[PDB]
Amino acid sequence: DEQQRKRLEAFLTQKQKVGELKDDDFEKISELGAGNGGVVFKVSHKPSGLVMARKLIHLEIKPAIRNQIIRELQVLHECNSPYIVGFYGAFYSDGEISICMEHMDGGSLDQVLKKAGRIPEQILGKVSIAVIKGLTYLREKHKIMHRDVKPSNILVNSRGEIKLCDFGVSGQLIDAMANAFVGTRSYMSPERLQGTHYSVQSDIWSMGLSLVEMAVGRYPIPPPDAKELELMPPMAIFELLDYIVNEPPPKLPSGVFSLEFQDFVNKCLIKNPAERADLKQLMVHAFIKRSDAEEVDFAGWLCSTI
Amino acid sequence: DEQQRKRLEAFLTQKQKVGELKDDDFEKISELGAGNGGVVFKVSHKPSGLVMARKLIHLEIKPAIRNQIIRELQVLHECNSPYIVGFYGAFYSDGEISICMEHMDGGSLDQVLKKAGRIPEQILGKVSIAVIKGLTYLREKHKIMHRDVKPSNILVNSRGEIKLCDFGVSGQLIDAMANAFVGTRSYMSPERLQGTHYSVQSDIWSMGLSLVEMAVGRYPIPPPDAKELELMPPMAIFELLDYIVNEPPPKLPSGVFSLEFQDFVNKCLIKNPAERADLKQLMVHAFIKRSDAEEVDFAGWLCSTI
Amino acid sequence: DKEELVQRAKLAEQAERYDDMAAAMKEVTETGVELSNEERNLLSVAYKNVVGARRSSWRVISSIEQKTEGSERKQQMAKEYRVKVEKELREICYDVLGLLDKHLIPKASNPESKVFYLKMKGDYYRYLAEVATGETRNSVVEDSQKAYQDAFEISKAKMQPTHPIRLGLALNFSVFYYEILNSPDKACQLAKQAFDDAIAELDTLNEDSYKDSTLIMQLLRDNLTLWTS
Amino acid sequence: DKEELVQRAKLAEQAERYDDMAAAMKEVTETGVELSNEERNLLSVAYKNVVGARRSSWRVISSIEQKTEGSERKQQMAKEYRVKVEKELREICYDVLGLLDKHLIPKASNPESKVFYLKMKGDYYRYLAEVATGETRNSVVEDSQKAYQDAFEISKAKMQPTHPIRLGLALNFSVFYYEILNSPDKACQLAKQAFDDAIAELDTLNEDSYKDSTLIMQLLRDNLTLWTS
Amino acid sequence: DWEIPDGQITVGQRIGGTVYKGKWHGDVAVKMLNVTAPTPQQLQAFKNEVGVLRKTRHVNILLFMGYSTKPQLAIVTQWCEGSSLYHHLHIIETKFEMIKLIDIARQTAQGMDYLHAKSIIHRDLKSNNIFLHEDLTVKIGDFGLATVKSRWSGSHQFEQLSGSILWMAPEVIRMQDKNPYSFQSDVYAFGIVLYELMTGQLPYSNINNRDQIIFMVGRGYLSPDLSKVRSNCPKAMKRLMAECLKKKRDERPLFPQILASIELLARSLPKIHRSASEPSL
Amino acid sequence: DWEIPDGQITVGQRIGGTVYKGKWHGDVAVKMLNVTAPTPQQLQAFKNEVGVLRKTRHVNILLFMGYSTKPQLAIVTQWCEGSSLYHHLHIIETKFEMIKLIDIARQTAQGMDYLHAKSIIHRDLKSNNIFLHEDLTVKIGDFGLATVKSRWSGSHQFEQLSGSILWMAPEVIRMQDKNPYSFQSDVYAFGIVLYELMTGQLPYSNINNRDQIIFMVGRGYLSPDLSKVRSNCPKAMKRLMAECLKKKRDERPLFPQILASIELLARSLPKIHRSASEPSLN
């Protein structure tokens, strides 16, 4: 708790040490990664000296809505949590909204999962706590759901922090992103895929699916065959979505994981959102009680795997 | 004379028999011949029943000048001579001024010279008279010179008539024809080629050159070589013109023609127009006195050679 | 209420009528309350487009008076008409300056806007000078010079080398040097200096004014290529 | 003198000043002397232009006021604009009819001229009737009806099927049938008949008006295909 | 041959592979493959795109002018003054008259008819790739996904589905065949273009979930709400739009039948400005 | 391949081989060889003309669209709305502003630069073959005499001189070489076009003798009277015109550089009437 407090203090300090943000203000250090419609750069904000992550999202949008996106992102200035990536500011230049945020030198759990092959149930426990607290934080103190929980959107750092990013804070930005290119997979809950339901219950499913991906080290969609599970052309996205909607949820392998863990992901992955555990119920779950109480050199495990 | 008078009477009567002229009024019988800028059709003028020659000359011209051309051609309605082809009327349709004229079923002396090989000095005598009278007629009763005398523009018929055609009556039409395609030969007098002089004296030269062409049955300009004269790639037009201007005039072969004929063409072909015989002088020429007095079945010679 | 007046003036501006618009904006300024940024451009458009329409009449009437070159009532009438439209021209500009130096020049909060109003009144004075020839010409020219010597200082002090208003002041002041005073060296030198300056902060061009900035820029280049000939 | 008035009106026509050119012509007609062919076209065009301007001004204004579908000062004092431009519209047409039935319709030097002035009368009165919805319209609709019938009789009697004026009368009378009376069947019949008799003497098209004749012809065809569709 | 020797092209500004405004015998558009080491897949892409453009000469196909290899791989085409149909319709909301909208439909159909007639399937037709050149002439561009129909069914092989979802036909989305593209898939896209033209809005404006649209359209649940056509839209157009949008691809008309209809739609409507009174001389 | 299968083309009106307004995927221009038995000379003509057009894709070359063989030999190209430069200048005497005239020069040069760059000599450039499409864009057409420069001097052989005389260079008229055509002969024609543009009239208006003009121009006696340029013609244009018209063909530069000189007399050439005051906010 004290450590997180000090971190937030330093963040606010650098925030006050800075002011406005614009494209000239920056020098590129390196490319942290890219996605379906966005690119992320490790940069040095010249006026303040701060190293930050700069995310550019290409959008062709009316001035009136770009300005509405910026204005709505300004709410992140108040979003202060050790489960939520920090926000420095936002702007629009050329053809692209820029979001400047807390640089996380550990990367995304997506990047990590590549180098680590599979993530140990004990680390995933910390991750599961981090996600729940962060989803709780967002929900209660900022009235919003994440929308997009998945390994590439949980970011980790040297100090052992696990933070959430890329959540749906600007409603206008959500709208402007709908005209998009096709993805190659999906973590969307079935009830959202069917327009049947829309709540935090859907972010819970995505956490569930993420966990299974991070545990087994593969893809939650389409499970694995009898042979493939012994070791441990891609299915088109429409087929993935059709799976999620019409087939039983994925699940953890029988022996390799504790019964508490298997039970935890299961209550996250129940097709019907009503019957699906909520944040209150998950928080007091056997798997969470255990993991909370465990002490793990998470920061150590992280640097050792990189 | 009486025969010519009767012909003129018939022409006038037929002229009164018809009224206005326009493109719908006509039915095509056959193509009498064509060239770089004009085409001639034997046609039947539907209202009157008359068979006439219809000449179309392609011109892209302003309405104000097309109407000036028509109006100026209307002077031909009065041009009545047995040495001048008859005029029925003129108009403009689509992209082309039409001149409707006395059909001459014998054709042009150009056409004739092809079938006859060479024209007998005695027939050429009649032709020489016809040309002079016609040039005189044009000059005195209509203030104009021909401009364009050559075998293709002397027309002959069954009744033994030799008439001139395609002379320069509309001054505007002359002007409008100057934007033209390149010819392949020329009958233009040297003084005209040099812009040095311009009179009937120039039409006399062309008659001269025509005669030599019609006599020898080849071209008056660029006279043949020693071998070629025994039998009896074309020179480019610029070379022809350069010849006419810079070389001695052509002339008749020594023995085959009477001295009177040789002398006649010679006084027509003198380079300097001043020293060149005029219509008065030519009219009383040895060759003309002789030929006038001779009686030749011209009409008979004509039908026999076709 | 002010908003009914500004909606009435904006609606009349959409109907291409510039008499009810000018009357409504004079009725706005007669209240003696300070304008916004938005309510000002409407006033300048009304008293500017109408002035331009009045000018075109003067130009074509004067050309039809220098192409006749005789002595009759045709050009007698031209003068009787030229002094008529010139007096009409005079009445409009005097109404503008009376509405300007009594509610807006002193009563303003934005220094950019204060420089703007100086551009407007100075431009109007220059237009008045560009037509009245005689004893009355000197005073109008002096007023235009005073306007130029006050807006240019605040432009050089607290404006951007890429702002629309400083560019417009440079443009109007250069054409003032070329047409009224006929010193094309100084006006041309000022235009060259503006080209050297306006280029500097080309990177600093936000969406609020790109069209105006590049529009005054190409107009400046066109005036330069006319004058260097 | 008349020539000063016609030079003043022609000069004002060169300056793109509708009302300016339109005055001088009222002063011409107030003399009460019969016009030529040339002096009629200028005044006619000026009147037409003024009419069109006022028409659009009210029509566009009225449409915008009825396109707010709320209840506020927008369609209250702001919409009072429609009655303003309608009264302006009324003043122009009353000036026309007062200048028409007192110096021109009384004595005719040309019967084609009589068809012309009756066509103008039907044009003005029909437009006024369309503009006023209420007790006023019944009167002006029948007035234009009598005027166009009176012109149509003389057109069918002593005009050409290819003349500009008979074509213009057919055009205006057809759009009168379509817009005012809303009987598109008789308008379709009328325009088709006028267009077919316009085909007959296609050969008889002198340089005086081929362009006008075919222009009214294709306009008639366009109105027909709009109304039959 | 259409290879432009190196050095002649003078790349300038940027717009949106990647596209620059350049210079080569006047204003041109230059589309470059930014990178430095062209993979043999990016290479065949280039070879193919050039291959298709080479076969086009029509006033409604954007004019291919030549290609460059040496500096970077690039395609040079005519420059356009004026905006895309996307820009007119959804950005500056240009208030076109219905006769103009019909005409834009008509021209777009004309260009497509010409391509299909030479067996080219465009595969990426959409508002953005339709330019109103000088505001008067529809030029269809971006042939980055264009392909020529092979006579033989086994040449196809595997291509990762790419493209804008709002214009993708259900069969294309589903991606069940070896080759789900057809002339008919292009028609469907043109169907969505009719939608933008007759309504002023993109389809599915209430849905902002990208994967949901892909899933619901591919499944048959979702399809454009034709009730949103503006009231001045000729009934023949609404019908023609619904026909181009049929889910069963074979039920869609092809472009001659499209041009056969469209031409008559213009004759089955009084497209004459507004009215016709007295034309003052 | 650009062969249009028979039946698709729908020939309509006539204009002026012979040219019709037709139909094939919209309005097109159809140029036909009217006759029925194509001589092998008319055949090679066709083959050659198509051959040249095939190599052109540029906004200032009139757009070749395809050819037909079966009904008659024909070339299909884009249709143009609007008139030829000939028609504007000498028929309806369009009152173009000098900036427009310069621009027409500029575009015509642009199209010619593009042809020469691919080694095509047009050989029949003149006012009539320059169309102001939609009044805004110069399209050079009629490639009936166009030819591609052969690397080898003996392929030429014999061709009967044809073309309009007012645009023929003295060396072409004289016709002394095996091949008197060159990029430079095209420039000379463009020179006469500058003449029409800067003067409003064709050359030699006092002379109406066709053969005399051929003879006097070929000989060096006759050349355009440059004094007849209108007074608003930039001095740079007059010079540029006189240069394109030089009798010694080599005294001429390339059209890329010619347009470079046309760009010289353009930036300071004009800025419209008077100037422009404060631009009213939209």
Ligand SMILES: Nc1ncnc2c1ncn2[C@@H]1O[C@H](COP(=O)(O)OP(=O)(O)OP(O)(O)=S)[C@@H](O)[C@H]1O
């Ligand atoms: N603040 C950051 N610090 C360090 N790396 C970051 C940061 N933000 C993003 N990245 C990396 O940038 C890449 C993209 O991550 P996201 O922005 O979350 O988008 P995404 O997870 O890839 O979802 P898509 O495929 O674009 S819809 C990833 O490799 C991140 O690890």
Ligand SMILES: Nc1ncnc2c1ncn2[C@@H]1O[C@H](COP(=O)(O)OP(=O)(O)OP(O)(O)=S)[C@@H](O)[C@H]1O
């Ligand atoms: N009135 C006519 N009667 C009979 N035949 C005619 C008539 N006019 C022309 N022809 C024929 O048509 C052919 C064409 O000759 P002209 O009409 O004189 O033109 P031309 O003399 O060839 O002028 P050029 O050099 O071709 S521009 C000639 O061979 C004549 O036989």
Ligand SMILES: O=C(NOCCO)c1ccc2cncn2c1Nc1ccc(I)cc1F
């Ligand atoms: O980033 C986003 N999607 O990923 C781009 C695809 O590559 C994203 C998506 C939706 C959204 C709504 N409001 C903000 N939104 C985002 N941005 C964002 C949010 C919080 C933080 I802290 C940092 C961020 F950049």
Ligand SMILES: O=C(NOCCO)c1ccc2cncn2c1Nc1ccc(I)cc1F
């Ligand atoms: O016909 C002409 N040139 O030949 C065309 C090239 O093929 C021609 C040439 C010049 C001319 C001036 N005034 C009329 N002119 C002509 N016509 C003509 C004259 C008299 C008669 I009797 C019949 C005619 F047709």
Ligand SMILES: [Mg+2]
């Ligand atoms: Mg993301």
Ligand SMILES: [Mg+2]
């Ligand atoms: Mg002849």
